[PDB]
Amino acid sequence: MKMIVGLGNPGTKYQYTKNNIGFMVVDKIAREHQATFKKNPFEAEVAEFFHNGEKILLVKPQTFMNESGRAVGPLMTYFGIYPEELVVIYDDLDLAVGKIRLRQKGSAGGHNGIKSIISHLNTNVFDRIKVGIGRPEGKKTVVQHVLSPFSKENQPLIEESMCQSVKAVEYLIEGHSFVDAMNRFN
């Protein structure tokens, strides 16, 4: 019973920011599967759907980025999902715009989002889909970069990456191991 977490900040004003790439992906997944998100006791938005029997959960934590694990951890202990079934989808500064990178473990940049999930799952090992958002080529700081939207030149690139992210999650859905998909998509 897979859980697919897409990281992000809550609110209309962050709905097109680089840091909400995870939200955008799990929204694409939700639409493709005709699923609706409902507010959940554990600071999250949760869409349920099936795919022959098996129950997939889509999770947008409403905790803000650095407290994601406060939502993800309890919600896994609630539904009974193990970390082997988890897939977290999020932004990655040190990966180029247009590129995606599936990894099964790691420190995961200096990502605050992942750091919270580590703390509350108490494991460094779980599947992840890094979507590259690039680093600031202008005068912006990191915080300005992630909490701003993409350029017009980068926008089609990220639509490419977001489709890939979806196709990877549909690959996993169709019964393929994350290791297979790591080879297929990395």
In order of 39, 72, 145, 180, the CA distances from 169 in angstroms are 23, 18, 26, 12
Q: Which residues pair with 163 in a beta bridge?
A: none
| Resolution of the PDB structure in angstroms | 2.9
Contact status, residue 153 vs residue 97, Cβ threshold 8 Å: no
* 55-61 vs 44-50, strand pairing mode: antiparallel
Q: How many CB atoms lie within 10 A of CB 137?
A: 8
The two tokens of residue 162 are 């977001």
**Which technique was the structure solved with, according to the deposited record?**
X-ray
CA distance 83 to 12: 30
Question: What does the DSSP assignment read for 22-86?
Answer: HHHHHHHHHHHTT---EEETTTEEEEEEESSS-EEEEEEE-S-GGGTHHHHHHHHHHHT--TTSE
Burial class (CB in 10 A: 0-12, 13-18, 19+), 126: buried
Q: How many CB atoms lie within 10 A of CB 112?
A: 16
Radius of gyration of the chain (CA): 15
Contact status, residue 72 vs residue 120, Cβ threshold 8 Å: yes
CA distance 16 to 21: 8
If you classify domain 3-185 with CATH, what class do you get?
alpha beta
Domain ranges of the chain: 3-185
The two tokens of residue 172 are 């996993």
Return the residue matching tokens 């997944």. Answer: 29
Return the residue matching tokens 């795919």. Answer: 51
The two tokens of residue 77 are 């202990």
Nearest-CA neighbor of 7 among 58, 47, 48? 58
Helix (H, G, I), strand (E, B) or coil at 90: strand
Return the residue matching tokens 């089609």. Answer: 156
In order of 94, 122, 168, the CA distances from 161 in angstroms are 15, 29, 10
